[PDB]
Amino acid sequence: MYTTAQLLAANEQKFKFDPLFLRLFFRESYPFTTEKVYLSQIPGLVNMALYVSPIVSGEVIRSRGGSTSEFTPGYVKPKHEVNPQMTLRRLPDEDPQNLADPAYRRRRIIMQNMRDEELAIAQVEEMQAVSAVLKGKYTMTGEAFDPVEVDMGRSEENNITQSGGTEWSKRDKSTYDPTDDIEAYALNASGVVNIIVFDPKGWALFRSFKAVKEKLDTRRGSNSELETAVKDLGKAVSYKGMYGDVAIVVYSGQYVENGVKKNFLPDNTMVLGNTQARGLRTYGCIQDADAQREGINASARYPKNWVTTGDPAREFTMIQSAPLMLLADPDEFVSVQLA
């Protein structure tokens, strides 16, 4: 009872969370108004022109075109409670030398909760895009929601796995040049590639090769400028510079699971990509009876606050949406898994 404790400042323990994907590739958002959604892709291919003699005949070459698929449903809703009986005790903040009414504490808790759902939904929005341009195939599996599998259309030629006996770690650091592997892997890209985003551990081995370091100092060999001698540590996505026409970007973002914090990208991967590649930020229809009454069926997010009647009274807060990250051209990127 006789303690007389005075409280100093408090801490935050913020995440390392910067999307880099809802901001670079997926700049365009298309809200829905209907149930289904299509994504056509013309299989543009020609055949070799045969050398048939000009006497007999010519075969009728089959016309091309035609491929469609649907990626419909999507959903998310992180409900929270208020439990009016927690405001009786004091928060970790609000130093005991100066307390406050238990009505302001409820407002602070509600604001913190709202920020919590905002962060939680922004976390799912980035994870969907990470799966999208990291594998070209995605699965939505969860409780009270049947699995929904999305085949974006990625081919097997853009999922190069380094596994074997010659990936990069079984090579000599000083003699080998990794640029040949880059130019070989980027051959099947179907468009210009100018960002090759790495991993925090996927950049140690690429830089380790003496060939790149010797290429950095040639006085006319290239126009590249790659800031080694670390430029920005202990942070989210940074820019190591330019490597000719292609920039170099390292992304060490983290998403928090139920209790564990896991990196967005695996330990050693790179993505041959383009900044001009179009990415979709489609949002579905909010399937809430109250929302339909205000005509807000087509919206990005939807906050809602309500209170239950009866002698046990409880308030609630919810954010409803339907983030359904899509990519028009799954073959625009190449996901190399190093080893």
């Binding site: 409780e143 009270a144 929601f145 049947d146």
Partner: protein, 109 residues
């Protein structure tokens, strides 16, 4: 030629709210929505209703699932239309099916 009979999808039969719950599932076959369930006689896991065990109904499945689903989500309150419930083939008596959920918050109207 081919008709397009369109009926509004309204499973509920009364104003009684439909409350949900989650519990481990042990399905032996693919089970669509509106499938009645019982508890396993030995492991007490959730399996599909056979239509012959009296009083075994405890709820109605809410979302589709299969053997890969560890935990099922099922309704535990409210009333449902008799025609909309995908009854098991073994249960041939309408009267028994209409009162199969008696003693529980689930009802058939």
């Amino acid at each position: 030629t081919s008709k397009e009979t369109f009926t509004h999808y309204q499973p509920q039969g009364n104003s009684d709210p439909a409350h949900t719950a989650t519990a481990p599932g042990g399905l032996s076959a693919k089970a669509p929505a509106m499938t009645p369930l019982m508890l396993d006689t030995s492991s007490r896991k959730l399996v599909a209703w056979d239509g012959t065990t009296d009083g075994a109904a405890v709820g109605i499945l809410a979302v589709a699932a299969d053997q890969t689903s560890t935990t099922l989500t099922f309704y535990k309150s409210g009333t449902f239309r008799y025609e909309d419930v995908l009854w098991p083939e073994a249960a041939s008596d309408e009267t028994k099916k209409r009162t199969a959920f008696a003693g529980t918050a689930i009802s058939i109207v």
